[PDB]
Design a protein around this ligand. Structure first.
Ligand SMILES: [Mn+2]
Ligand SMILES: [Mn+2]
Lengths: 929, 295, 165, 302, 51
DNA sequence: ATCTTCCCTATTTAAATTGCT
DNA sequence: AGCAATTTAAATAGGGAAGAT
């Protein structure tokens, strides 16, 4: 590897980086180094070139592509290294940036006018309840609305009038309404409980007129008259001139505001709100010290009076203005040019040369990567990102362990921690034992990286470790919940960090089908927000349903419409890149996405069907599923075994179902040597982690290394009874599976856990589908709702899987890829597709995906909750002693193959099952006994 | 303190001539006798060498050794036929991996095991020829080179004494050196005290292969003071076996090509860097001693 | 003032403080603290500590006190005599509980028992939480707990190593 | 392989000492043994409990025991018989799929050293915890198979070489390695002084109850048999960071220090016996520790 | 099993029986009564029992 | 508008000296 | 002997103004 590093730094920092860059490369003179170094040499050079201080101006070239660029060095757009750099380059009709500046400046000088009431003064001094009857943002909104109703609010002297209690402060003037919504929602968004309003309201002001004081601001309301008697000590020199210059700025630019569309207004006001909380939290974090008394805004850690309200408003204004400037004029730090990506894929990765069919100069890209598992999907996503140049992306993945797997792939192929940042925000205690030096695994949290210039506008220089890893990451391999808060939050400033993260970075969401329906709705909201700033969305899901692919394209198309009309460019359409392991297709799609997507789906189906059938599923006829499991285990051991040893996966639905199947199979008298494992999610930290590592090392069938992790000498049935934790994110390879039916994507995923690593075709049948789910004996009205898309609004007419599924069927992604809306009441696949198009629709609703008008409100974050689960309290095992109503029990010790013990950790119990003892056990975790 | 760069992937490579080697402002550099200060990339240097009129200091040697750069001094040869004595500072403050030295000792003390290792290392130069084929000079797979390496392999297979190995060593060196001489149409005699460019390019490559061999041996902690091939003529240490594994494959055709094209010594330095870097000859030698040690 | 160290070692089978108290008792019974040798403890946080430190002005040698503590030699350690310009001197504080002062009211004021209960019924009952030792008293035949706390340095000491007045 | 330990696996106690009865003698009048009586003095004081604030007004007439030497005898005499029994490898509740493998894995145990340290803890005065403290003269007489042994100056912390302990250790190791039993009548005479207060073992009282119960057989002060059994097996100097001999426990755990020395660092007895029945090479010290546990006994099942 | 509760006391009461320290011999008294009619079944049948 | 020349303008590099280890 | 702090100063870059085509 031959690199060349050029440096244009000033001051003695130029000399301090010369020591390190002259420790690793030869000096060619004139502050230019050039030579041969290794991969990790480049890394050590990155780590000790960035850590040496601020102001490092380093460009590295590997062959002729830029390896890395330290700082905001413009470096290369076409040629490299400029000369007479200077200012005043373009100076356009910027319009919408002047609009955002005027809105943020006018609102930020009015965002805390409502702290001047006597209640907030005695709240800061501390002789009343610290919770206000009406929040000060609403009081400042009442001030601004009363001033606007009285005088002309855009060109007049200010003077705060006598204000009363107003239920609504939103009128008709679109720009005033924007300023009012920025003022009122600078801490939290208003929440609308009204069902008719949630049913009908769509527009900007027409929804904003329904935002009343009862949506969170009106806490208790007994001291309203003191909350609206206000002093007017803000009339000073610099506050009045700042208010005048920003109001006239808005006055001069609001003529382009009425030429915007609804989508524009929503996205622009979201940006304005994010910059306003950025400036407000930035000025509230630091201590300024000086004060002019008689009025105060915030309190220090000692509770003393600080940050008087005139200079507080001025500081929040300038900090929000500077926030806006750096978030709207940033050339963000991108990743290194990974040299182990750009070469050609060989063999089964040979489809990854589809990036040589995509244009490298497209400003936008919507990848739908429909490639099957085991083909290197995430490596292909990184290849697609690097085809357009240097990489800046957020790999948002479900589960901690899948982020760990993608991080380990990124580490061992070409990516160091100067470009990658693995973020899992829980600090799990799963450590690697055996040998610390001989590990060559366990990707960790260090991020030598490079701190971006956006950290100076965040509160108190961003944060410590976690938010520095969030914001400053070129490549952010993260759990997805660090990105879905970009679309907005209920309370606080947790929106700004993923918002500013997704503003300048691409978004790569892998296996989006494993998320929930509301989770997929907020993920497509994130896709729309990412496309709002021209970034590229890579979706990587093999079993995509047309509905999902369509609504994600429509979210990207609305976002790219926002980005196109935001830079005053005519919208040519979205560069959609359909991708699988058999080919690629790049089309400029502005309309008719459905026929092209279904034609690519049909081409992928015909490229999947002439291949040999790997998963032949038979739906059993035996009604009782207990003895159906027994007979199917006996049949698939007598048919599918490797010299007497067979691996079976009993995929069931819920935990007590799993322990019921386990306790039946343990007490089942047979000549077969059944060896039973329980693989559900309710387990203690230690025990769970141990199951994972063992299962990953015994079900690895790409080699014969497993022969030494199990007793393959004696003919044995190694059976793993598992819940849907096996069908998501597990690289497992079973000889056969017996599936309790809950949804068709569960069938396809548990087909993907059988012969995942081998290529031998089954002869007779490798999957035995149960006749009924076990909830049929508990609830015959609805049985597929647990881990399925059946529900109270979408009920199957019959629950028989002979009626709702094929008796003999080759299970692949084809049934999920096709998409059928008719006959959803008597087939599982059409039931699935129905729900997917009836929840992820092209409407705005309130919990929908095109959400417009409601982004202003708190409604999409309350009624569409990301990871909406049950109450979930956590019973914690502390050194062998349980906390709550747990009561350790003893398992049946009949056929347990492996049982790992646990002493620490915690189990997640729903509040429903907290009533009784969860009865934790070493073999199977939680049950009802 | 990080992984400190592994030795087999270290890339830079110098022999410094007529310059006092010092440290300015953090980095190791060398200052010639005209005021020119050229920096040494000590974190990626494999070895440095010191010719006549050179002088290194203490903290420069420390920054080379603690980073792990083996340093030798080129002069010291005073006999008529032999490269006599090269003085070589080992970085022993870095505590080395141990069991590779134990394996080398368990093969060194057993006489039949040393002979067995002597056998495989004599055909290691034969496979070096086969793997590292240059674009210029001779072709390795011609009838003459294959006939002589076949006679060499047949003779070293039936060998039973180290003096027979020394004799067959002499016929091998005479055979290759003279065949290269024939190809480049010159008369060649290997004298280290000769003004002919085919000779002092060969001594420069002797110093280069010496530095490569001590970096390969020090990367596995192997001392020069365990020569598995020994004799009256062959008394230099283990460096005169792991250095001349790669004469007739790497250095000697490169030395003959450099003495045929006939620019200065610096193109030969840079060509040695280029071929030791492109084919990873250092990592190749380390991996070969790796498959030697555990067998 | 020069000083010497007596550190209790290997006293796990028996508490460390029992060995400390027996060191105090054996230093009392075989002289040592005539009027001028005093004790201090470097580690009173909540325990009395495991180091006895003797800061006699005239000078304590190793031989006399190692002959004195011949009985504790299995689990004792004596350091060489070092010097210290300031030692942190402790004194004796004692507790009274009901009947103690009642008998005082018998023998000083000459009042009867019931009125002595009457003047002291709602009073007394202090509780010392200071670090302490447990001392065999030989002249008065009962074993008790003696409490030590920090006070200003006094020229004269008792027979136990604590300050006077 | 993978010889999994039985859940019922237990071993009997092989060092059985009697209760250490305590008498008052003189140093030169060793035959006149008068039994040390536990006196008991009453103490008047109100009750102070966390659960009953209403009962603190009146009650709790407590009467705390004590035990001193009489004011005419200056020597405390402690008599107990330590019974070492053989076949320490026989499990009483275990069986012989695991215990027989233990027999054939701990046959190379040097019982000589094990027994030495047992008889040295017998003789040096490890069985005399708080009443060897402050004694100007320590003496131990061991009577074994009509043989009398005299010990005067043995430092208890290190196991130094004396041919007297060694002599008994021979027959003790011959018992412990083979089949049978041996009985050591141990009488300790410690000259504490005239009327010095002695230390019997303590019965467990409740958080309330009385202050302290001293151990009584038929009115006379004594010390617990298991407490002496703690003394005899206090031979463990082979754990990592071994400073003082601790009692040989299956986890190397001392309660009074609040730490366990062999727990959680792969040197606990259970991992070593599973290593023995799976046949990895043990050193001499941990195998001696395992044999000392099997001599101590206890149920090892899970 | 778990080694992290090797700390703190086990502290419980058991029953014990020792000889008093004035007598050194344990006597065990019992009466063993062997009884005849061993082949008759007390409550079983009369064919299988006599065979 | 474009481009050049020149004057601020101070920001930015290189040398120089010298205790300190 | 290397370096560090710290001064000192020479030079590099840029912006504004004015004069040419
Ligand atoms: Mn506020
Ligand atoms: Mn504020």
């Amino acid at each position: 590897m031959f690199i060349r590093i050029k440096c244009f730094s000033k001051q003695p920092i130029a000399k301090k980086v010369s020591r390190e860059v002259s420790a690793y490369l030869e000096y060619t003179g004139n502050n230019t180094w050039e030579g041969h170094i290794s991969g990790q040499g480049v890394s050590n050079l990155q780590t000790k070139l960035i850590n040496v201080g601020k102001g490092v101006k380093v460009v590295c070239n590997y062959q002729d592509k830029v390896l890395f660029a330290i700082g905001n060095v413009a470096m290369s757009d076409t040629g490299s290294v400029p000369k007479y750099t200077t200012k005043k380059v373009y100076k356009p009709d910027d319009s919408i940036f002047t609009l955002k500046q005027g809105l943020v400046g006018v609102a930020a000088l009015w965002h805390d006018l409502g702290k001047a009431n006597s209640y907030f003064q005695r709240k800061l001094r501390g002789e009343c309840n610290p919770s206000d009857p009406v929040r000060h943002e609403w009081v400042s909104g009442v001030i601004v609305s009363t001033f606007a109703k009285g005088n002309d609010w855009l060109s007049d002297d200010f003077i705060i009038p006598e204000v009363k209690h107003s239920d609504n402060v939103f009128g008709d003037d679109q720009v005033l309404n924007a300023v009012l919504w920025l003022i009122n929602t600078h801490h939290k968004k208003g929440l609308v409980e009204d069902p008719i309003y949630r049913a009908t309201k769509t527009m900007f002001t027409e929804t904003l007129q329904c935002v009343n004081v009862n949506g969170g601001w009106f806490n208790y309301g007994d001291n309203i008259d003191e909350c609206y008697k206000i002093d007017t000590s803000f009339i000073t020199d610099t506050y009045v001139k700042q208010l005048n210059r920003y109001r006239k700025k808005l006055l001069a630019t609001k003529h382009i505001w009425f030429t915007l569309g609804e989508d524009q207004k929503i996205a622009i006001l979201q940006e304005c709100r994010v910059a306003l909380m950025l400036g407000d939290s930035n000025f509230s974090s630091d201590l300024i010290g000086g004060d002019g008394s008689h009025l105060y805004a915030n309190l220090d850690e000692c509770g003393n009076l600080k940050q008087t309200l005139t200079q507080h408003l001025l500081g929040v204004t300038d900090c929000a203005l500077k926030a806006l400037f750096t978030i709207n004029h940033h050339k963000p730090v991108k990743a290194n040019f990974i040299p182990t990506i750009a070469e050609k894929g060989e063999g089964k990765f040979a489809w990854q040369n589809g990036v040589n069919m995509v244009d490298s100069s497209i400003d936008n890209m919507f990848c739908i990567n429909m490639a099957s598992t085991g083909k290197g999907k995430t490596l292909a996503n990184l290849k697609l990102l690097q085809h357009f140049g240097n990489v800046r992306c957020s790999f948002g993945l479900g589960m901690v362990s899948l982020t760990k797997q993608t991080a380990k792939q990124f580490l061992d192929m070409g990516v160091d921690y100067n470009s990658a940042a693995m973020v899992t925000g829980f600090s799990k205690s799963r450590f690697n034992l055996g040998s610390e030096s001989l590990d060559q695994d366990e990707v960790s949290v260090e991020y030598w990286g490079q701190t971006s210039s956006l950290s100076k506008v965040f509160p108190n220089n961003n944060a410590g470790f976690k938010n520095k890893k969030l914001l400053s990451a070129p490549i952010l391999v993260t759990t997805t919940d660090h990105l879905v808060k970009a679309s907005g939050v209920k309370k606080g400033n947790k929106q700004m960090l993923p918002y500013v993260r997704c503003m300048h970075s691409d978004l790569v969401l892998d296996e989006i089908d494993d998320y929930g329906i509301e989770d997929m709705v907020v993920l497509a909201r994130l896709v729309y927000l990412t496309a709002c700033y021209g970034n590229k969305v890579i979706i990587s899901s093999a079993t995509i349903t047309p509905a999902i692919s369509n609504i994600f394209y429509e979210a990207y198309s609305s976002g790219y419409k926002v980005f196109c009309a935001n830079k005053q460019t005519t919208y040519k359409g979205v560069n959609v890149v359909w991708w699988d392991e058999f080919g690629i297709k790049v089309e400029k799609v502005t309309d008719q996405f459905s026929n092209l997507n279904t034609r690519f789906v049909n081409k992928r189906i015909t490229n999947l069907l002439e291949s040999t059938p790997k998963h032949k599923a038979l739906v059993v006829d035996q009604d009782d599923n207990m003895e159906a499991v027994k007979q199917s285990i006996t049949t698939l051991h007598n048919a599918h075994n490797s010299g007497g040893v067979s691996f079976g996966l009993i995929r069931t639905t819920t935990i007590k179902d799993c322990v019921a199947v386990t306790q039946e199979l343990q007490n089942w008298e047979t000549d077969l040597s059944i060896k039973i494992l329980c693989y559900h999610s309710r387990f203690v930290g230690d025990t769970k982690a141990q199951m994972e590592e063992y299962l990953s090392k015994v079900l690895n069938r790409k080699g014969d290394e497993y022969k030494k992790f199990v007793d393959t000498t004696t003919p044995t049935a190694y059976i793993v009874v598992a819940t849907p934790v096996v069908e998501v994110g597990r690289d497992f390879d079973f000889d056969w599976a017996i599936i309790e039916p809950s949804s068709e994507r569960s069938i396809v995923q548990c087909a993907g856990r059988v012969l995942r690593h081998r290529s031998s075709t089954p002869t007779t049948h490798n999957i035995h589908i149960l006749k009924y789910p076990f909830k049929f004996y508990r609830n015959s009205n609805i049985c597929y709702d647990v881990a399925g898309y059946e529900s109270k609004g979408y009920k199957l007419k019959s629950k028989n899987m002979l009626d709702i599924y094929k008796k003999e069927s080759i299970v692949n992604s084809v049934n999920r890829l096709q998409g059928d809306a008719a006959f959803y009441t008597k087939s599982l696949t059409a039931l699935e597709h129905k729900v997917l198009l009836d929840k992820l629709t092209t409407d705005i609703a309130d919990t929908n995906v095109f959400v417009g008008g409601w982004q202003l409100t708190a409604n999409p974050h309350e009624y569409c909750k990301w990871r909406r689960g049950t109450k979930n309290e956590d019973l914690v095992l502390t050194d062998g002693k349980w906390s709550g109503n747990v009561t350790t029990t003893k398992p049946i010790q009949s056929k347990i193959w492996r049982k790992w013990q646990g002493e620490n950790g915690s189990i997640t119990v729903p509040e429903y099952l907290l009533d009784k003892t969860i009865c934790y056990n070493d073999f199977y975790g939680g049950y009802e006994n | 303190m990080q992984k400190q760069i592994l030795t087999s992937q270290k890339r830079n490579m110098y022999i410094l001539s007529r310059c006092k080697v010092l440290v300015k402002n953090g980095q190791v550099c060398h200052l010639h006798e005209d005021g020119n200060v050229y920096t040494v990339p000590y974190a990626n240097t494999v070895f440095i060498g010191l010719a006549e009129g050179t002088s290194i200091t203490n903290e420069a040697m420390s920054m080379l050794a603690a980073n792990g750069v083996i340093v030798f001094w080129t002069k010291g040869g005073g006999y008529d036929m032999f490269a006599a004595d090269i003085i070589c500072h080992l970085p022993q403050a870095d505590y080395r991996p141990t069991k590779y030295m134990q394996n080398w000792v368990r093969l060194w003390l057993d006489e039949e095991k040393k002979l067995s290792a002597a056998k495989e290392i004599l055909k290691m130069r034969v496979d070096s020829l086969s793997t590292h084929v240059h674009d210029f000079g001779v072709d390795v797979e011609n009838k003459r080179v294959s006939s002589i390496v076949n006679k060499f392999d047949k003779g070293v297979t039936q060998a039973t004494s180290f003096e027979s190995l020394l004799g067959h060593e002499g016929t091998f060196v005479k055979s290759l050196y003279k065949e290269y001489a024939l190809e480049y149409e010159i008369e060649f005699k290997r004298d280290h005290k000769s003004a002919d460019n085919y000779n002092k390019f060969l001594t420069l490559g002797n110093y280069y292969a010496y530095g490569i061999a001590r970096s390969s041996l020090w990367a596995l902690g192997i001392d020069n003071s365990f020569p598995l091939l020994h004799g009256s003529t062959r008394r230099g240490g283990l460096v005169f076996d792991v250095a001349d594994i790669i004469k007739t494959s790497i250095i000697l055709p490169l030395a003959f090509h450099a003495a045929d094209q006939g620019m200065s010594n610096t193109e030969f330095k840079r060509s040695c860097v280029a071929y030791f870097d492109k084919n990873d000859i250092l990592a190749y030698l380390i991996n070969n001693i790796k498959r030697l040690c555990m067998e | 003032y020069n000083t010497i160290s007596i550190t209790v070692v290997d006293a796990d089978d028996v508490g460390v403080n029992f060995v400390v108290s027996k060191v105090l008792s054996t230093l009392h019974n075989k002289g040592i603290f005539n009027g001028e040798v005093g004790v201090t403890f470097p580690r009173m946080d909540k325990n009395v500590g495991d180091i006895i430190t003797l800061f006699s002005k005239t000078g304590v040698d190793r031989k006399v006190l190692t002959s004195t503590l011949n009985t504790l030699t299995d689990f004792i350690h004596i350091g060489k005599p070092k010097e210290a310009d300031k030692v942190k001197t402790y004194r004796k504080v004692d507790t009274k509980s009901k009947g103690k002062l009642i008998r005082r009211c018998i023998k000083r004021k000459g009042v009867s028992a019931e009125t002595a209960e009457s003047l002291y019924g709602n009073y007394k009952g202090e509780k010392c939480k200071l670090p302490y030792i447990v001392v065999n008293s030989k002249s008065t035949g009962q074993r008790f707990s003696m409490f030590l706390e920090e006070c200003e340095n006094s020229e004269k000491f008792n027979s136990y190593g604590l300050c006077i007045v | 392989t993978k010889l999994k330990a039985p859940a019922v696996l237990a071993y009997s106690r092989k060092i059985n000492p009697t209760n250490a009865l305590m008498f008052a003698v003189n140093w030169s009048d060793r035959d006149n043994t008068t039994a040390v009586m536990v006196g008991t003095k009453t103490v008047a004081g109100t009750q102070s409990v966390r659960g009953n604030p209403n009962d603190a007004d009146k009650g709790n007439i407590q009467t705390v025991n004590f035990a001193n030497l009489p004011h005419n005898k200056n020597t405390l005499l402690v008599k107990y018989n330590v019974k070492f029994v053989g076949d320490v490898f026989k499990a009483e509740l275990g069986g012989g799929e695991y215990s027989n493998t233990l027999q054939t894995a701990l046959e190379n145990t040097d019982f000589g050293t094990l027994a030495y340290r047992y008889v040295y803890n017998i003789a040096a005065g490890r069985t005399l915890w708080r009443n060897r403290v402050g004694a100007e003269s320590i003496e131990t007489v061991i009577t074994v198979n009509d043989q009398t042994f005299t010990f005067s100056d043995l430092l208890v912390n290190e196991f130094d070489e004396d041919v007297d302990v060694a002599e008994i250790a021979d027959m003790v190791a011959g018992v412990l390695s083979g089949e049978g039993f041996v009985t050591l009548k141990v009488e300790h005479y410690m000259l504490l002084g005239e009327g010095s207060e002695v230390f019997p073992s303590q019965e467990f009282v409740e958080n309330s109850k009385l202050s302290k119960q001293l151990f009584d057989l038929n009115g006379q002060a004594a010390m617990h048999d298991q407490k002496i059994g703690n003394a005899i097996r206090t031979i463990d100097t082979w754990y990592e960071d071994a400073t003082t001999p601790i009692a040989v426990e299956p986890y190397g755990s001392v309660v009074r220090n609040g730490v366990a020395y062999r727990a959680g660092n792969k040197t606990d007895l259970f991992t070593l016996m599973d290593g023995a029945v799976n046949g990895k090479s043990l050193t001499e010290e941990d195998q001696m520790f395992v044999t000392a546990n099997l001599i101590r006994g206890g149920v090892f099942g899970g």
